Design a protein around this nucleic acid. Structure first.
Lengths: 166, 232
RNA sequence: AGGAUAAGUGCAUUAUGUUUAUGUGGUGAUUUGCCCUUCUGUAGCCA
RNA sequence: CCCGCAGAAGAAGCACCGGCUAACUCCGUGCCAGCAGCCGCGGUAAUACGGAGGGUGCAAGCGUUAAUCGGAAUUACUGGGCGUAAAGCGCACGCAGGCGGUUUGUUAAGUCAGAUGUGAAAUCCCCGGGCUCAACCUGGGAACUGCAUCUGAUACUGGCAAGCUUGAGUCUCGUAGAGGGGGGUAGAAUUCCAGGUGUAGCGGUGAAAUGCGUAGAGAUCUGGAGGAAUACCGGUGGCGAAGGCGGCCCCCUGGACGAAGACUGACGCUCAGGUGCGAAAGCGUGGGGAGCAAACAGGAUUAGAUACCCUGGUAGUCCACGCCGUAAACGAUGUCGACUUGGAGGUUGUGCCCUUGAGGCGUGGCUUCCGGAGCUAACGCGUUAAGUCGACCGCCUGGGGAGUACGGCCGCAAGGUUAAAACUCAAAUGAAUUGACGGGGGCCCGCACAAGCGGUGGAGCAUGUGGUUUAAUUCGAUGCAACGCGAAGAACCUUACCUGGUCUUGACAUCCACGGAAGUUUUCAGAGAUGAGAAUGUGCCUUCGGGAACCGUGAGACAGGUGCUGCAUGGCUGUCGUCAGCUCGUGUUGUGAAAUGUUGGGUUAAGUCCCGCAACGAGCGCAACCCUUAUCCUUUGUUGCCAGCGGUCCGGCCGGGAACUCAAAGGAGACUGCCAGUGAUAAACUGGAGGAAGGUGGGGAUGACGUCAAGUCAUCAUGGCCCUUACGACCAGGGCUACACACGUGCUACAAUGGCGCAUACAAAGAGAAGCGACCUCGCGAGAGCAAGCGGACCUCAUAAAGUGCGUCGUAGUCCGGAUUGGAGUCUGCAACUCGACUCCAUGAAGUCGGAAUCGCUAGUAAUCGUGGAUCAGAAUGCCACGGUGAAUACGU
């Protein structure tokens, strides 16, 4: 029954909660749906939507789905090495290189999602849909446009990426 | 919210009850009120310990109480004075010479009403009731029973409006009519008003209760197979 | 005599599958929304 | 600015507490008052509101709006959108401007580097410095936000000359098509006329009426009239600039599609302005009118009926040009082009084929399905992009109000054209899930219908409901989910209701105080409560202080409360439905809401079972254990039974007997297991058979999660919260059950399958310890008081009735039905008048199987007759269960 990935650190970021209705066909039951984010400290594509009778059983379901069919991904230093504009499904987010002298600057549940992602110093404005369910894809799409450091000279910088497989 | 009549229409048809006595005619009413009274007043006196089932019984010339507990000798006291006092009041209310024996039920360390005590505390103190019913069912299924149903109602969590919620697990049939299965309805108040839990617990479908008798009573234990029958 | 591809025996309503009056507005289900991990960390929030 | 001296003195606000955004309890009122920067709230136990405690934040300040930046790629050159959300110009052609595949020559407008001059001061910025830090001011450096020219380069764009082809243009050859302009031409329905033949409906539609017609309609033969129109081929085809083009053919001519020979050689791309240009109707004149139609009338529909639907009927439709060219005026996607895995459809140049069927392969064509890389929020796109992009132009900045106003312009003339705000408002708007729902398409079930049979509704009665009435005729409940139900035995009591007496620890518990013991017998007053007197008794525990018990008296604490609120609640239950499905844990597919399972086919009480897709594992409904019946085995042998036998009137009453039912229980037997048909192989249904019995044997148990603000605070639990000389409590009387009727349910009749008369038969089950009960005496009968007896298989309710035997009866209220009413006799109790129940004597009406409406039922059922019981002070027409006699049919949805 599946392989799972782990981090040596705890994430229990509950982002949303909902309830399921059929309203006449068996009427309406007490069930909830839930969305929970499991990072790594440097990032994961870990996002899980699950559902059950009660809120606790529901979140723990959703926390399980945030670590199966998912793998961890990694980025050196608290910044991102590319000024790129991550888009995922109308929720569009921005990054530009920065200092360590600034840490996070963000609010709500977003400051908690960016800390595990490693893209919190580079944190620039979000636009399009910025309600909780889709705003939180920073650590997914913003780590699939990824750049990360491996060179010793800027003029060997494109040469060094070519010889990584040649 | 139809709430099918959960146990009354299910008894005496190989399903034991919390009384076993014989009465008939017009005096059945005088024996039942007396049996309610002794049920109410006797368990209040042995309330020092928690208690799992209550059985009061009236055979020829005697009154016999069976009581079931999570540990034995505990309602019986020390010396023997404590239990002669339990027999004083059983005679006083029923009006017949009294007996009591101590016995335990199948799966003794678990019972219907001790789950509802556990769920009630959080609500009494107006804090931590959103995982409490679920943890009650988890503990309950770690201590025994083949399935449990819990339904909680109240102005729950101290809320300024009412909520129904429930939690069910394992194998708890609802048209069942064989083996005793243990039921409690709590009723209690706190600062905001009334709370309540309906706790059905299910031990076994042939485990526990009586079984159907496997013979006639007519051939057995009869040292002389006649009075005359024309054969002498 | 070509109204003789004889139905290519390939044929079936063949392209709108339609019409005989209506009835106000909101309302159910919780005050811990809590029971997965070292270091880089988290749901009021922590190793 | 400093020293020294008194002294705790001389002193704190402001804003927050539902969420946005640093904080929650109680009381108040109960969508009211009042709050809101935004979002919004208030409808009872309010953390939104009003006040208080407390909590929170800033602080001699605090809080707050308007405006600027920023939050906001929502201020977008860096850095937004335009298929559908606001947004591709209506379309072609193209000057100015912006832009230029590729090479050589050449020039150096822009480009970039180098050089030099300039850019004072700190509040800002970077480094010092000084004033009690700081705020402030300031030296050196600087962002100094602004600016200059010379020298040099040619990688880059721009200028220019000659090519190149890798862009585009052009000739002949061939080919497809409804492109444009102008000519030619046939048959047949509607419509008409004529004559011949010929008689009554024809028409219209959902069904319908208005319409047309006997003056001869409709139809039919022959022959003439006339104009729009031209199938099927015709397709997802093809053509035109986009919208646009449709009978077939030619003339004049455009524009596209292919192929080889041949040529020119960036002649290129886009396009502000611009000129040019119409599907349709609008519309001037000319042509023309068979059918249909806005209008106008009339029908049909209905609260009407302008929508819906029809019928007459006109301009219009129908043709041609012409006047401002409207729109869903579109590869929905600007223009045009380059590049990116294909396959195939439609249909077409052409090479090749057995030309083997709109085909395949070779190589182009527009044009469409399908899906990969990549893209979307979703549908969808995908080589014709919505991919990767290119240049260059168009356009958008929340909604409504507005494609209007306003301005410029064009138009006989209505109009067209780009395109806005105050004001209003927190939304408006693209997409999709599941429920419900289609009147879009289709599938399924319950005795829900059918196949019938009977019942309520009509009579009368029983009993509940409302209407209506009084002192009051108490509520709760309102198809299915109220009405033989809570609230099953209702004189008062009951009991809510109403009135009259009477008291407040109080009917009841404990605790203090006083008078009577309670209990029993007994006279009396008053309504009875209550009290007085007589006679019996002074018990119970003890400090004989004093109290419990019952009753009166009194005080607190406290008892009591069909006290309100069922959006404040707990417990509890009705519905869908025996729906045939629902849920618990968990994975997966989508960004997700959520689905999937839990949905299909076939089969079923069934998540049962064959097939099968993301469902896997398990529970619920259902199956089961279960009690019961049926024969039959089996044991007991009375309070049960009797084949033979005795006492004997021939009765298990009793000597006696055990073949036998027979009672209550172990159970056996029957499993859709078999065989055959049906059924997708298959679950399973039906048939088949022995047998007491076959459809999961007969019966019963038996009903998921749960919305429904469903119904009870009135069993009972209970807070907020009110009375506690009372929203408690003792006592009598009155009323629900009145009567106007309607309404739910059931009862028994209207017949003759029945009633009557006479004669005649067999039960099952159960209830009786203040009770019923043989005998007894009394009694028209019911019953009465006494009592052996009883514990109910012993004794009694009990003559069980219908049914059976024979005769009888004809739709006449009878030979059915027997209500009312006079009048007598009875029950529990001082006390039966209205409100109670049963017996019986005489007379005698309503009612002919009841309309709208409407349900239950598959077999011990349905129907119908009696019986007992629960209830139960007193009594049943009901209910509940039993036994007598005991049915039609189940195709079909």
């Amino acid at each position: 029954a599946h392989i799972e990935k782990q981090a040596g650190e705890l994430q229990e970021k509950l982002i949303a909660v909902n309830r399921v209705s059929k309203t006449v066909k068996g009427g309406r039951i007490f069930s909830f749906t839930a969305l929970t984010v499991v990072g790594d400290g440097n990032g994961r594509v870990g996002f899980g939507y699950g559902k059950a009778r009660e809120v606790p059983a529901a979140i723990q379901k959703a926390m399980e789905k945030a670590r199966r069919n998912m793998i961890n991904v990694a980025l050196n230093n608290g910044t991102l090495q590319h000024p790129v504009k991550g888009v995922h499904t109308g929720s569009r987010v921005f990054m530009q290189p920065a200092s360590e002298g600034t840490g996070i600057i963000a609010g709500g549940a977003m400051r908690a999602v960016l800390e595990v992602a490693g893209v919190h110093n580079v944190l620039a404005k979000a636009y399009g849909s910025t309600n909780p369910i889709n705003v939180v894809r920073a650590t997914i799409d913003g780590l699939e446009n990824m750049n990360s450091p491996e060179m010793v000279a800027a003029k060997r910088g494109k040469s060094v990426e070519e010889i990584l497989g040649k | 919210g139809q709430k099918v009549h959960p146990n009354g229409i299910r008894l005496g048809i190989v399903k034991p009850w919390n009384s076993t006595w014989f009465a008939n005619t017009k005096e059945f009413a005088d024996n039942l009120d007396s049996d309610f009274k002794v049920r109410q007043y006797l368990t209040k006196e042995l309330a020092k310990a928690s208690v799992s089932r209550i059985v009061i019984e009236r055979p020829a010339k005697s009154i016999r109480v069976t009581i079931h507990t999570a540990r034995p000798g505990i309602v019986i006291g020390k010396k023997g004075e404590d239990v002669e006092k339990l027999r004083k009041v059983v005679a006083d209310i029923a009006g017949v010479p009294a007996q009591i024996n101590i016995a335990e039920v199948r799966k003794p360390e678990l019972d219907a009403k001790l789950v509802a005590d556990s769920i009630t505390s959080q609500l009494e103190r107006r804090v931590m009731f959103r995982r409490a019913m679920k943890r009650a069912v988890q503990n309950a299924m770690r201590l025994g029973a083949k399935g449990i149903k819990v339904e909680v109602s109240g102005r729950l969590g101290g809320a300024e409006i009412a909520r129904t919620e429930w939690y069910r697990e394992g194998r708890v049939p609802l048209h069942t009519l064989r083996a005793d299965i243990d039921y409690n309805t709590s009723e209690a108040h706190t600062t905001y008003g009334v709370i309540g839990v309906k706790v059905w617990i299910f031990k076994g479908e042939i485990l526990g209760g009586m079984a159907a008798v496997e013979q006639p009573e007519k051939p057995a234990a009869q040292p002389k197979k006649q009075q005359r029958k024309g054969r002498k």
